[PDB]
From a paper:
[name] ([name]) is a bifunctional guidance cue exerting attractive and inhibitory effects on neuronal growth through the interaction with heparan sulfate (HS) and chondroitin sulfate (CS) glycosaminoglycans (GAGs), respectively. TSRs are a unique feature of Sema5s and enable interactions with heparan sulfate (HS) and chondroitin sulfate (CS) glycosaminoglycan (GAG) chains linked to the protein core of proteoglycans. We determined four Sema5ATSR3-4 crystal structures to high resolution (1.56–2.72 Å); apo state and complexes with nitrate, sulfate, and the heparin disaccharide mimetic sucrose octasulfate (SOS). Sema5ATSR3-4 is a rod-like dimer; superposition of the various structures indicates TSR3-TSR4 inter-domain angle differences, which may contribute conformational flexibility to the [name] ectodomain.
The novel architecture of TSR4 supports two symmetrically positioned ~20 × 20 Å-sized shallow cavities on the opposing sides of the [name] dimer. Positively charged and polar residues (K505, T732, K734, R747, R749) from both monomers contribute to each of these sites, together providing a notable positive electrostatic surface potential. There is an absence of clear electron density for key [name] GAG site sidechains, R747’ and R749’ in the apo Sema5ATSR3-4 structure. The conformational flexibility of these residues is consistent with an adaptable binding site that can accommodate GAG binding partners in vivo.
Author numbering:
A (entry chain A): 656 to 716, 724 to 755
B (entry chain B): 655 to 717, 724 to 772
Amino acid sequence: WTGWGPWERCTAQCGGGIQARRRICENGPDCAGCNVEYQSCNTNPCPELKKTTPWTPWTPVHYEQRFRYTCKARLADPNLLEVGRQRIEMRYC
Amino acid sequence: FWTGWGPWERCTAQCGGGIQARRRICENGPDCAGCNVEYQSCNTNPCPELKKTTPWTPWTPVNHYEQRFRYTCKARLADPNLLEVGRQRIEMRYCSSDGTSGCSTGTLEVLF
């Protein structure tokens, strides 16, 4: 066996991944041991990415009020977090 | 000599790519002519788009009809515990004696 190679690219930036190192056994078809080794990488929990919903329209209570929420997700990419459309529910008085 | 291969065991992740491991044992030997553990990909399907609903806003009149609002938080994750909705943030304002003024009629401009 040759010297073990450096650990390659980690799969994910956070929340668990795998990192690989490899080696080659020159002039040997079946050598002693494994040519490839794996390890866990970036085992830190992913940051709690957050996005805010749009404000609701102003409605009277003379005071007028409106509301918004925040969508919190443990993600490695903000593009994987999205806020859906506004749902209006109406009934008569 | 190597013994029979073991089961593929457990996938690393539920979705988005993982590794499954199976093993064997070199009987009466420290160094057999192979690798004791074998890997294969598992659960390469993309993770589902989980959706959670925000709490409803209080019912409010329109002008007689009453309305309320909510949104949906969508995230591609393998675990629902990693998606949550934050606290409701309320912003108010004063409409004063006009009932409108800055709330609805903006800046009243009169030309004399």
